[PDB]
């Protein structure tokens, strides 16, 4: 004849979460940028024998 409870009282849990992030960066661009591919010498010949 005994009956159960409508529900059981559970235990409560507290959650504490921490997220930490640090970012650092450097960027350098120094100097002189010369050309590396340049035209060279040329030579041509032409003649009419007849």
């Amino acid at each position: 004849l005994a009956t159960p409870s409508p529900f059981d009282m559970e235990k409560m849990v507290w959650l504490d979460v921490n997220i930490l992030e640090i970012r650092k960066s450097v960027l350098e661009n120094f100097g002189v940028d010369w050309s590396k591919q340049i035209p060279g010498p040329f030579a041509a010949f032409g003649k009419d024998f007849v």
Partner: protein, 50 residues
């Protein structure tokens, strides 16, 4: 250096004055210097080198 000579184009009238012609002459391609060095207005027999 190239030669500067007088020439008469083919198909032209025989009474017209001659025009400016040339011998063997080279206009080299400039790869990365294209647009930086002027070739249209450059006297071919080069006076002034630097």
């Amino acid at each position: 250096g190239p030669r500067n000579v007088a020439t008469i184009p083919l198909g032209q009238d025989l009474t017209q004055p001659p025009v400016a012609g040339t011998g063997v002459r080279v206009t080299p391609p400039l790869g990365s210097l294209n647009g930086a060095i002027d070739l249209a207005n450059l006297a071919r027999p080069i006076a002034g080198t630097t």
